[PDB]
Structures are given as structure tokens and as C-alpha cells.
Amino acid sequence: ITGTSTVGVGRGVLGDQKNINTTYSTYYYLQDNTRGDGIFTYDAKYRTTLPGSLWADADNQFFASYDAPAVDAHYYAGVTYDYYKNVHNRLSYDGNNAAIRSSVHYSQGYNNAFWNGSEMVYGDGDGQTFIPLSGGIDVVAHELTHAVTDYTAGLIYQNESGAINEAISDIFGTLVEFYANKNPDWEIGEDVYTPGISGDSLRSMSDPAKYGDPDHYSKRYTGTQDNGGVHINSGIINKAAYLISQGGTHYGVSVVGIGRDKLGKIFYRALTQYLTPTSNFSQLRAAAVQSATDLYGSTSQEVASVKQAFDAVGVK
Ligand SMILES: N[C@@H](Cc1ccccc1)P(=O)(O)C[C@@H](Cc1ccccc1)C(=O)N[C@@H](Cc1ccccc1)C(=O)O
Numbered sequence: 420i421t422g423t424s425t426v427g428v429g430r431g432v433l434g435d436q437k438n439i440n441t442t443y444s445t446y447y448y449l450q451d452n453t454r455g456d457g458i459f460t461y462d463a464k465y466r467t468t469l470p471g472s473l474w475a476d477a478d479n480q481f482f483a484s485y486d487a488p489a490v491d492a493h494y495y496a497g498v499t500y501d502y503y504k505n506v507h508n509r510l511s512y513d514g515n516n517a518a519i520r521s522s523v524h525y526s527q528g529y530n531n532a533f534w535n536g537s538e539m540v541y542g543d544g545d546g547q548t549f550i551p552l553s554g555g556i557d558v559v560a561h562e563l564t565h566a567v568t569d570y571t572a573g574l575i576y577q578n579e580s581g582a583i584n585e586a587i588s589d590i591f592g593t594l595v596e597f598y599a600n601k602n603p604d605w606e607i608g609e610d611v612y613t614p615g616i617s618g619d620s621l622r623s624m625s626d627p628a629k630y631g632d633p634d635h636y637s638k639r640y641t642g643t644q645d646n647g648g649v650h651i652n653s654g655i656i657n658k659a660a661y662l663i664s665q666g667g668t669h670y671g672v673s674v675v676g677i678g679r680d681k682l683g684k685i686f687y688r689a690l691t692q693y694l695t696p697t698s699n700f701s702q703l704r705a706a707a708v709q710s711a712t713d714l715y716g717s718t719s720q721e722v723a724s725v726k727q728a729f730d731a732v733g734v735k
């Protein structure tokens with residue numbers, strides 16, 4: 420839409436108040452003109468045709484219950500854009516300020532979110548397994564990071580390359596969560612998962628096995644479900660990433676942590692400079708070591724920590 424930039428106010432999925440960048444032209448639209456070529460949020464109206472209708476509101480106030488997932492998708496896409504730009508100097512997911520589009524209210528009781536090759540899509544959840552998925556900043560960043568990966572490494576979504584693809588999305592989803600300083604943790608999906616159960620989450624980076632995912636290469640899933648276990652074997656890389664950042668002793672191997680900022684810098688460089696569509700875990704290790712080398716030198720601690728971390732999860 421062509422119109423005047425302005426700022427609206429609303430309440431997100433978790434009942435928190437926030438301001439959002441809108442555009443005025445008869446109606447107020449969920450269109451943010453302050454970031455690249457824009458952030459656009461659409462109403463899919465419980466159907467599965469996409470993108471649906473650009474979100475329009477009569478008074479620039481978004482306190483209706485139906486409004487909540489739109490508010491959060493719009494706002495958290497903005498935060499995620501700011502992260503990539505401010506921290507990694509990347510302009511949107513393609514690096515050339517591509518417009519970011521999201522649809523909410525996809526289908527009925529849909530317990531998932533996804534990037535469809537062109538935009539982000541969020542279900543409302545069934546109210547037992549999930550609440551509307553856009554309420555989790557680690558969810559939103561997970562999804563936008565799939566876009567970044569597609570435009571960079573292009574990791575195919577099956578077997579080991581697909582688990583790397585998934586790990587990258589969980590890792591940057593977590594880094595954005597810390598960036599926004601929004602009750603940050605090394606857990607995945609805790610804000611929107613199982614609203615009847617406190618303290619849990621969909622996945623854990625600090626301890627994947629807590630929710631049944633492998634934390635060692637020896638325990639990798641070798642079947643064909645979940646595209647050869649992309650959301651399962653991701654736990655092996657998530658643990659590795661957690662150790663590089665935070666440190667720890669895992670299966671007898673001790674890792675000195677180097678912190679989140681360096682974690683992000685090393686994995687961003689690996690993703691954008693060295694990974695390929697068919698990279699496997701062993702190639703990821705090579706890429707990570709080379710990136711750390713690039714950044715910190717071959718006899719640095721950072722390089723040492725990267726090696727220890729992959730050793731700890733059994734990836735040579
Ligand atoms: N590509 C998505 C999966 C998909 C494939 C094909 C078609 C549609 C959707 P994703 O990884 O982005 C989904 C991702 C969303 C998420 C991210 C962070 C935090 C929470 C949720 C994800 O991990 N989804 C789980 C959702 C889920 C868990 C338990 C029950 C039912 C569904 C899965 O698909 O495995």
C-alpha cells in the first residue's frame with residue numbers, strides 16, 4: 420500500500436502491550452516502511468490460501484483477541500530484521516532488503532509454522548499443544564532464518580544437511596531471543612508450547628535429551644521419518660552450539676565457553692561462506708573451525724573451543 424507511515428499500539432499473544440509500525444491510507448495497515456522494502460502482515464482468515472489479505476484496521480489500535488498473533492508476527496519480524504542488520508550487517512533474508520511477509524490465522528487449529536519458499540506462515544495452535552505460534556520470538560526468528568539459509572548455503576531439507584538447516588534456525592532463533600532480551604533461555608518454543616504446562620519446551624539446546632533428542636552422534640536417528648530426522652538430529656548440533664557458547668563437560672569432554680556473540684559470528688560466517696546444499700555434520704565441523712580460524716587465528720582459544728565442542732558430541 421501507498422500511504423503515510425505511523426505507529427500503532429496493540430497487545431500480543433501473551434497479553435503484553437507493544438507499539439507497531441503501520442501505514443495509513445483510509446485504513447491502518449500492518450505495513451512497516453522503516454525496514455528495508457517493508458514488513459507486511461496478512462490475515463489468512465482460517466483458510467490455507469496465501470497470503471490472504473494485507474492486515475487492515477480502522478483505528479490503529481490492536482487490542483482485539485483476533486489481532487494478537489498479527490501484532491506479534493509483525494513486531495517480531497521487525498526485531499529479527501534488526502538483529503541481522505545490526506549484528507551481522509545483513510539486509511533482510513536475501514541481503515538486498517527483500518520485503519518480509521507473514522500470514523497469521525492459517526487454517527484451523529494448526530500446530531505449526533513454516534517458511535513456504537516465499538513467506539512465513541503461522542497457525543493458531545489447537546490451544547492445547549500450542550497457542551498462536553507467532554507469540555514466540557524464537558519461533559519467528561527460526562522461520563526467518565530458514566529464509567536466510569535458503570538464500571545462502573541452501574542446505575537441502577533431509578538427513579544431515581537438513582538437521583544442520585534446523586539447528587541453524589534454532590541457534591539464531593535463540594540468539595535473537597537474547598538480542599531482544601525477552602526472558603532469554605537455551606530452550607526452543609517455551610513461550611507458545613503446551614499452555615497447560617509450565618516449565619517445558621519443544622526442544623532444548625542445553626540438554627536435548629530432556630525431550631528425547633540425541634546429544635551425541637552415536638545416538639543419531641537413522642530412519643526416514645521427519646525427513647530423516649531433521650528436527651531430531653538437530654539436537655546434536657544444538658548441543659555443540661550450546662557448549663561453544665556456555666562451556667561444559669559432556670561425555671567426559673571439557674569445553675571452555677567463548678560466549679554468544681562469538682558463537683553467532685562463527686556460525687554466521689560458516690553459513691554464508693563455507694556451507695553448501697549437501698553439507699554433512701563433518702563438513703559443518705570443518706566450516707566452523709575454518710570460520711573461527713578466519714576470525715580469531717588458528718591457535719586461538721575460540722578455535723580450540725569449536726574443536727572440543729564437536730569432539731564432545733562425537734562429530735569428527
Ligand atoms: N519447516 C517447518 C516444518 C514444516 C514442514 C513441512 C510443512 C510444514 C511445516 P519448521 O521447522 O519451520 C517448524 C518448526 C516450528 C517451531 C520453531 C520453533 C519453536 C516451535 C516451533 C518446528 O520445530 N516444528 C515442530 C512442531 C510440532 C511439534 C510437536 C507436535 C506437532 C508439531 C515440527 O514440525 O516437528
Ligand SMILES: [Ca+2]
Pocket residue numbers: 476477478479480481482
Ligand atoms: Ca482496531
Ligand SMILES: [Ca+2]
Pocket residue numbers: 596601602603604609610
Ligand atoms: Ca524464553
Ligand SMILES: [Ca+2]
Pocket residue numbers: 557593596603604605606607608609
Ligand atoms: Ca527460547
Ligand SMILES: [Ca+2]
Pocket residue numbers: 609611612613614615616617618619620
Ligand atoms: Ca508449556
Ligand SMILES: [Zn+2]
Pocket residue numbers: 561565585588
Ligand atoms: Zn525449522
